[model samples]
Target chain A: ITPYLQFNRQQWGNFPLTLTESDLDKLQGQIEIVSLKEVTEIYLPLSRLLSFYVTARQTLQQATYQFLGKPEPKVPYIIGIAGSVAVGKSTTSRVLKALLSRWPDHPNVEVITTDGFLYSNAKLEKQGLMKRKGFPESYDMPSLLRVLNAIKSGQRNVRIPVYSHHYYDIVRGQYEIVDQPDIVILEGLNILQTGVRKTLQQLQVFVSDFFDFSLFVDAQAQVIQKWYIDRVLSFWRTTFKDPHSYFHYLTQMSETEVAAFAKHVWNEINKVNLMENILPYKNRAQLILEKAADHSIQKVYLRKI
Target chain B: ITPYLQFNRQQWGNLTLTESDLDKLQGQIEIVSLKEVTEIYLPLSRLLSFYVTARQTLQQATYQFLGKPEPKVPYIIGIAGSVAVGKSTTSRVLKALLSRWPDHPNVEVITTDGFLYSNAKLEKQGLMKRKGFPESYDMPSLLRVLNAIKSGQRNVRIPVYSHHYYDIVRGQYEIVDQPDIVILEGLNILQTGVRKTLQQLQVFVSDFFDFSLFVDAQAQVIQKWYIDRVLSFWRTTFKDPHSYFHYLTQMSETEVAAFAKHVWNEINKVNLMENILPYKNRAQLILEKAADHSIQKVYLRKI
Candidate 1:
C-alpha cells in the first residue's frame, strides 16, 4: 500500500520552489515525500483511496458489534507517528492534520505526545535517575493509565501535559484538554514501551487498545543519524543561542565541537533508543512512513496482511 | 454474611454439644462463660478469630477461581494486632487454609502493621496522630479503598510500607501487587468509641463484603487495663502518682487489690470496653470455650 507516486515538479516550473525535489531524490534511502506539493501531485488521490478503506473499517466494526449483540459500536481511530528526533515529524504531523481535516467528512483531528506521562522530578531525584531523562522508567505509568482511561471513557474533557523541547522539563499545572474528536493521533518515540512488571502490566490497558489505525515514520539508520546531527546543529545556533534555552550549555562549544557531540549522542543514546525501544514496536504500526535524508517523506508502506 | 451462632453453657448443655460443631466454628467469634477470665477466654478468641477469617477468606477465593481465569491474583490479607496484649495469632491450618489448598492459587497474607502508609498521607490532612495507636491509622480513606477493591472496580492496588521492623527509619518501599482475597482485620475497625466520621458511615467494603466476621470476647477491656497498669506499677509508685493510671498503680497497698482495685481502677477502661470491645456481638458465631485453653463450647448464632 505505497502512497508515494512520481511527481514531475518541473511541470510546475512557473510556481515557486519551496523545497528542492532533486535534493529530496538523493534522500530516497531515508525519507519520503508526502508534502502539500507531493500530495497535490500524488497523495490527494491516495487520501481519497484511504477514505473508502477507513469507512469500510468502521462498517466492519459495527457489523462485528451487531454479531456480538451489542446495542451500539463506537469506532475511534488512532494514528501513531515515529521517526528519529529530527525527521520532520512536527511538520508531518501538521501536514497530516491539515490534509485529514480538508476531507468532506470534516473530521476532528487531535494529537497527543508521549511526553505527558514522564515521571515527576521528585520521583526521579529519589531514584537517582536525573540523567537518564527519556528512559522508560522516567514515565509515570499510573498517571498514564488515568489519561488513557479518560480517553476511552469518552469524557467531555481530558487534560494531558504538553512537552517543551527548549525548556527540558515537563510544564506543571498545564494540560491539553482533549474533547470529543473523530480521530486522535498519538505521536511518540516509545508509546509502545510495555509496563515494567507483571503487577503493572496486569493493571495496564494500553492506549493502543482504543486505536483503529496508526503510523510509523521510518528511515535508514545512517540517514536518521545524519538528520539528527543536522537538526541538533541548527537548534544549537537558534534555540540554544537563547539565554534561557535548556541546552544553553552547548553555546560555549564551536560548531565543529557541537556537531561532533551531536554525532556522539546520536550513536550512543538516540540511535540505541531507535533500535532497542522504538523500532521493536514498529510492528504495531499500520502505515510505515519511509523517509529521505533531506527530511522529505518519499514512500509509505501500508500493512496489507 | 452472619456465619456464627452463640450459645452459653446452659444453652450448650440443652443442645447435644458435638465436636463437629466446635471444629466447624473454629476461627469464628465466640466467648466462654467467665467473669474473671480475660486472657484465658477473651483476647485469645479475638486472635484466633482474626487468623481464621484471614485464612478462610483466601481459601474460599482460591476455591471459587479453581479452574477459571485466575492467572495471578495475589491474595494479600492484612492483620492489624498490636504489641503483646496476648492477642497473639496462631497459624492453624483450618477451614480457611483447607479451602484454598484443594484449588490452584497464589495466596499471601500480610499485616498493615507491616506496611504503614506514610504517616505523611495522614499528617498532611492534620491527622499526624501520635503514631502506632488507632488514631494513627488513616482509617476512613483506607476503608473506602479496601471497599473499592472488594467491589472490583477495575484498577486498584495501594502501595505497601513498613515502619518499626525496618531499620532505615526513613526510606519506605511500595507494593502495587493486586490480589484476589484481601483480609484486613484491625482493632480500631470495630471501635465504636471513636467519633465516626461521614467517611466511616459510607458503605464499607467490610459491610457489603462476601463474609466479614468479628472475634468476640468478654472482659477483654478489664484485662487490658489491668495489664497496662501492672506494667506501669513500679513507674507510678516511683515517679508520678497523678499519672493517667495513678489509681491502678496506687492499689498496691490494698487487700482487695486483686478484685476491688481492678473494678475501681477500670472506670475509663471499662467505658472503652463497653463502647468498643463488645463489637463481637455482631459477629457470626460466638465460639464459646471453657476458662482453660480448651475448646469446650461452641455458639453458632442465629445467622
Candidate 2:
C-alpha cells in the first residue's frame, strides 16, 4: 500500500499540478483560481488520458470482433477539445497534441482545428455573413464534413486547409497534408451542437463522431467575460497597435473604452451565443476543465459514466 | 383496445395495409421498396411512404429546436443513384425524392451511369452488351462514388480503376467512398468476378457500405428458362407433349442449349454487359425470377 501510495503522491505532485492541490484547498474554502501554466500541466495528463482512450477503444474493438460472429479491425481513435473563444482551446489543443505524440505509447498524434475549416473571408464577405463569424452557419459545413470523412475513411494523406490568425481567414489554395496517424485530436466549437435539421439529424457523423474522447475547457461566466476582455485588450495593445492589423482602428480608443467595448461584445453576442447555443452542451462532454475567477485551475469535473 | 387489437391483426396479416401502413413501414426502412403497378399495385401507398419518411425525419429535427434558446435549421440530404442496372432503385428513389419534397427538403440525387461506356465493344462484336457496354461507364466507379453520400452508412464503397495503367481484369479496381445513402447499383462488381477475377477481399464500396441491392436479369437464360418455365407449369397443369407450343419448343438438351446461347448472344449478352449489369452477381439482391413469362424467372436471387 505504501509503495502504491509513493507513486501516487509523486505523480499527483508533478510540476504545475500544484494548482490541483491549491484548487482542492481553495474549493474547500469556496475560492477560485486560474493559471495558464496549470492549463499546460493538466493538459499533459489529459492528453495522456486521451491517448489511453484511443488505445483502449482499439483494443475493445478488437476484443469485440473475437467474441462476435464477425470481427472488424479497429478504426482510428479521435479526440475533440472545445471551449469558448478565449479559453485557449487552440493552445490547449496544441500542447495536448505535442504532449500526446511525445509519449512513446502514441507517437503519431495529429491535431486539427475548426479554424482551418472556416469559410474564406472572401466567401464570407460575398455571403455577407462576416458579422456572424464563428457561428455554425459561418463554417463551410460540407467541405468540413468532406475533410473529416476523408480522414476517417483511412485516407493515407489528408490535405486540410490552412488557417492564418494574422489574416484571420483561411489562406486560399494552401493546405496542410497530414499523414496517417495513430491518434487524431480535433478541436472545434459547436462540435457538440447537433440536430441542425431533419435530414441533418440523420447525419449523425459529425467531426466529433470520429472522436473517442473529448474535453471542454470552461471558466465561470464572469471569469470568461474577464478573459475575453483581457484578450481583446492584449490584442489592442499589441496587434491592433500595428498599422497592418485589421483591428488597427481599435488602437484609437482609450484602454478603458476599448475594454468596455470588449465587454459589450462579450455580453451582447459571445455570452448570448455561449448561454443559448454553446454552453448548453457542457454536460455532453466527457471532461470539463473548470477555471477559477482568475482563469486558473479551480476544479476538474470528470463524468462518472 | 380496439385499435391495438386491429393493429395486432394487421401486423399478423400485413397485406391488410392501407395508406397509413405505407407510412409506418417507410418510416422504419430507410430505403423505399416500391412496386409501381401503373398495373401491379397502387402508387398511392408507395408514394405516401416516401413522403412520410422525409416528413418524419424533418419533423423530428424541427422538434429538436422547440425549447432551445438559439434555434437554427440546416439539413442536407444527398442521394446517389447509379445506372439502368438499378431501375428498381431508381423508381423507388424517385418516389423518395417526390415524397421527401413535401418538407421542402433539399435532396440532391445524381447518377454516375448517365455517361455511356466507350463504344469499344461495338467495334469488336456486332452485339453490344445488352444494357450498356463496359466502356459506356465514363469513369463508372468515379461517378458511382460522387453523390454516394448518406447518413450512418458512411462506408459508401467505390472503385478507382487505373483504366490507362492496367487492363481491368475482372475485379481490378479499388473501393473508395463513404456516403450516407449511396444507392450505387452498378455492374462489373465495382471490381471483378469472385475467386478468379481479381484480388479477392473487401475492396468494393459495397463491401462495408450499407444497404446495397443489385437488380439483375440473366443473359439468354431467362428466355429458355422462360420456355422451360412454361413447360414446367404446363406439365403440372395439362401434362400433354402433343401441344402446339410444346411440339416446336420441346428442345433436346443440345437444341435448347443452342437456342439459349443464340438468344443470349444476340440479346441477353449485350443486356448483360450494358444494362442488366451481370457482373454484379456479388450484389445483395439476386431477385431470381420464375421461368414463366408471368412468374418463376430468377434462379439464384437473394436480398
Candidate 3:
C-alpha cells in the first residue's frame, strides 16, 4: 500500500542550494526562525524540482502549440500544501513560495489558502457546524472550484477574498487579485481530500485535480498536540486579548485553565478531525514532510510517480 | 476502418412507430410532418431505449461488484452539427421521445450555445466578431458543468441563451436536476479543440457522452439552409428592436439576401470547413440529411 520513496533528511538534504540569504530572514504564527539549513536542504530541493517540472512542461507546451500552429497560453503550475491545524503548514508554504519566486524565470508566484473559501462564522453558527469549522463541509467547494477553474483557464484578474483569523471568517468585499502568476501555492487543511460532498464517494472533479504538486506536513499526535497548545497559548496572549477578537473571552481564564481549554479543544475537536478526515488523505499527497518534536522536518516521503 | 452500421432511410425507418403528432419543432430550419415524426424519431427512440436499458443494468451490476452504491448518473448524449442543418430539432425531438420512456422519464436537454460567453464580455475581449467560433465560448464553465453532471451533482445551473435577444441572458439560468438522460446539443460538442489530459485538468465534452449524434448535411446544402433561415428571420424575428438581427430589417430584400450569404461565407461556412466538419467521424451516430432536409441515412457505430 505504500507508494512513497522514503528519504531521510541526510539523503535528500544534500541537494544543492538555489535560494539566497534574504530567504533566511524572509519567512509565521509561532514559526521558530526557519534555518538556512532547512531551506537549503528541504524547501530548496522542492523548489528546484518544481522548476524542472515547469521547464519540461513549458517545452512540451511550446512544441504542442507549434504543432497546432496556435499561440501558446499561460498554464501556471499549481501547488498544494495540506496539513492539520497547528502543523505550521503556512510556514512551509511561505518558504516554498519565497524559494520558488526567487527563480529568475518565474518570478510571479502567488500564495493563497483554502481558508478564504470557508463559510462565514455567522453561517457556520447558523448551520450548527460552528465546531466543525475546519471540516470538509465547512468549505464552499463550488465557489473554490469556480475560482480555480478561472485561474487555471488563464483568466485575468481572478479574485480571492482574504480570510481573517481575528474574526475567524472570510472578510467581505476585501480581496486579492491574481492575474497571470507563473505559479500558485494553495495551502489548506484538507486539500488532498476528495469529494467534499458528503453523498459522493467518487466525483469527476476535486480541488486536488488542479494541483501539479502537493505536500502534506506530517507529525506524531503528541508532537502536534503540544504545538497546538503552544500556538493557542500564544493566541491567548496576543490575538485573544484584543476586544474585537472572536476568542477574546479566553483572556479571562488563568494560564492553567487556558492550557486545559486548549487541551480539551485539541483532543475533542482537532484530534478527531485530523484522525478521521485529514490523516487518511496523507497518502494522496505527492510528498509528505514528516516533522520531529522540535518542529524540524525529519524525513521526506515522495510519491513514486 | 469504418465502425458504423450504415443504413439508408428505408432500413432504419422500418423499425417502428409510437406517435403521430410532435408537440413542436424548430432549428433555423425544420418542417417535419406528423407521419414523418412518428416513423423516423419513434424508431430512433426505440433503438436508444434498448441501449439505455442495457446500460442501466450493466452500471448497476458494476456498482454491485465494486460496492459503490452511488447515485446513478445521467447517461449523457451530445448532438453536434452545422448550425442550420436541423441540429436543435434533432435534440428536441430526441428529448421528447426519450422522456416518455418511463424507465427514464427525467430526460433533459441543454444547448452548449448557452455556455457561450455573454455578448458584452465577448465584445470587451474583441471576440464578438467570432462569436460562434470555439474560442468565443466559455470552455472552463462548459467543462465544469459536464463534470458536475458526470459526477452526479444535483441542480447544476446552466446559463440560458436568448435567440430573441441573440445573446447569453444576463443572469437567467436553468437547472439540470436529477435526470436519467441529458442531451447536450451544440455546434462544437464533438470538436475536441483542447487536449483532454494536457494543461489544466480536462474533462472534455466528449468524455461525458455515453451516446453522441451528429446531424449531417452536405456543406453547400447547409450554407443554402443558412441563407434560407436568415431570409425567414428577416421576414419575421428581425422586426423587433429587441431582436439582435433587428438591424437586418433596415435593409431591402436584395440587401438582406446579400448580407446573409456574405455572413454564411465569412463565418458559418468557414467554421464548418475548419472546425465542425472534421469532428463528424467522431460521433457515435450520424443522421445524414438530404438536400430537402429529410433524414436520408443513419450511420450507427458498430461494436
Candidate 4:
C-alpha cells in the first residue's frame, strides 16, 4: 500500500488562498511557465501548509530553549526540494519562495540550490568527471553539509559559494551570505539522495537530514526526456550564442544534430541517474508531486504524518 | 493640561513582572546592579510587555473584523536621553528581561548611533566639531531604517557603529530579521525636526514608534558624569594612538578634566538645549534620574 494520503489537484486545491492578480504575473517559472490556475490552486495551498509547519516548529523550538534555560536566536525553517533534471524543481522552489515570503509570521524567505554546491568545471575535468556531471559524486557534499549545519545552529553571516551558470564553474572567491532567514528553501537533484558514495565512514549526514519538509517533483522518465531535450534546444539557441558559453561549440551544429545530441546526453547521463539513483528516494519524501504530459501537477502524494 | 500621568518608584515598581533569571543581565551610563534590575528594570519590562501585547491584540481584532488574515507589524519602543544619562544600561536591561517572555521571544535592541554620518563626511561637511548634534546624523537613512523595521521587513541590514573605531564600521552590518518587538535606543529618537522641517507632509522618526521613553537628569549631574567618563576614556580608550579622541590624551590630568568639562559645556550642553531637551515632553514616559544615578521620579505622559 502507498504510505501517502494521495490527492488529485481538484481535491488539494480546495484549501484557501490570499493572492492578487498583480502578484500572479511576476511569479512565472524560468523558461517553463505554470498556468495562473496552477499558481492559485496548487502552490497557494502548498505555501499555506508550509506556513503551518513553520509556525509549529517555531513554538516547539522556543519551548525547547525555555526548558534548557538559555537565550535563543531565531531558528530558520528549512525545506528541501528534490527531483530529476528538467522536472521543474527551479520553478517549484521560486514560486514557493514568493508565496512563503508573503506570510507575516515568516516573511523572510530565501532559496539556494545544490547546483551551487557542484564542483568547478576545472575540478570536474581534473577528476575526469565532466561526462558524469549531475551525478551524486559531482557535489561538494562536505561543504554543503557544513553550511546547512551552520544555518540550523543559529549562527549569523554564514557564506555559501556561488556557482555561475554563465561560466559553468564555481565563481572564484565570490560568496553569497545567508544572514539568518526565517525560511530557507534548498532545491536540487541530489537533495533527497542518501546513498552518498560507498566509502563513507560512520558519522555521515545527508542534506535531507536538515530538511524540515521535503518534496519530490515526480514525472515519468519519458516525459522528462522530452522536456530535457526541448530545454537544451532552447538554451542552444540562446545561451550557446555567447562565445564564453561552455557549450558554445554546439552553436555550430545543425538543429537536427543538436536535438539528437540533447537526446543522447539525456539517455546516457540524466535518465540513467534518475531511474537508478533518484527515483528510489521518492518514497522518502514528505510530499510527491507527479506531473502530467503538459507539466501540470496531476496527483499529489502527501505522506501521512 | 499636562499630558503625562506620572508614577513614583513605589507606585511604578508595583507593575507585575515575569522575569525569573537575574544572573543573565550584565552592564553601565555603563555599572548596573541586581537591585536596579528588580527595583527599576523588572517593572519597566512588565510595562513594555503590556504595551506590546496590547498592540498585537488590537491588530488581530482589526484583522478579524476586516475578514482578512492577521499581519505582523513590530512594536517599536523608542528610548531617548542625554549623552551620559545611562540610556544604554536601561536599554540592555529591558532587552534581557523582555526576551524571557515566551510569547514574544524575539526582542531586538538597536542604537541610533549607527545612523550617524561617517566621521569623514562630518569633517568634509565642516560638522565634525558638532558631532552628536541632530545635523551631524544621516537623517534620511535613520528614518529609512526605522520605517523598514516597523514595516516588518526582514534581514534589514543596519549600519553598525563602533565606539572603538569611533565611526560607522564600513562593510560590516547588523541584520534585523523578523522581530516581535524592537527597542530603538538613541539620543535622537524623540527628535522631531532640525528645529526646522519640510512641513505638513513630512514624517519624523518618532512617527514609527508605538511608545517612547526619555531618561531625564539634571544638566550639572550629566556634566560631572561626562567629565568622570572622559577621565576614564583618556586613561584607557583615548590613550590608544588610533582612538578618535587620542589628541586629548596628551593633556595633563587636571587639563583633561577641565577640557572635558569645557567640551560638555560648549558642545553637549548646547546640543541638549537646542536639540534633545526640547523633545523630552514628547516621550510617553520620562525616568528622572537622581544625582546618585537611581531613578528618583517617573513622569508618564498622561494618556
Worst 10 residues of 3 chain B by lDDT: B20-29
Judge the docking of candidate 2 as incorrect, acceptable, medium or high.
incorrect
Regarding TM-score, does 3 or 4 come out ahead? 3
Per-model CA lDDT versus the true structure: 0.47, 0.48, 0.74, 0.75
Maximum-TM-score candidate = 3
Model 2 lDDT at residue B256: 51
Candidate 1, residues A1-305, lDDT tens digits: the string is 12112223332121111323633443243234444456453234334434444444455445433432334334344565665566556655555554454455536767777767776666778998655556667777677666655565455587899767887777889899777565566776756444553531133234443444566678898998888888789999899989898889999999999999998888887776676566766645656666666655566544321
Candidate 2: count of backbone clashes, pairs at least 3 residues apart or interchain: 38
Going through the candidates in order, state the TM-score of chain A alone for each one: 0.78, 0.80, 0.93, 0.94
| Of 3 and 4, the candidate ranking higher by DockQ | 3
Candidate 1 lDDT, B1-303, residue by residue in tens? 221233444433331223543454354424222331222233333333433344344334332322122232323333322222222232122223323433312233333343234555546766433333445555555554554443333444443443222211244333334444445545443332133531122222223223223333345543543454455453444245544344544445443245444543444243334333434333333343232433444433221
Angstrom error of the Cα, residue B2, model 2: value is 47
Stretches > 4 Å off in candidate 2: A1-41, A61-75, A198-204, B1-303
- Estimate, for each residue in B87-197, the C-alpha lDDT of model 2 and write its tens digit: 444434433443333343332233333333333543355523433444445443443344234212234443332222212233433332331122333443333212222
RMSD of 4: 21.0
lDDT of 3 by residue, A71-121 (tens): 537567788898888897888888888778877777788888889999998
Off by over 4 Å in 1: A1-35, A41-46, A57-75, A120-122, A198-201, B1-303
Ranking by lDDT: 4, 3, 2, 1
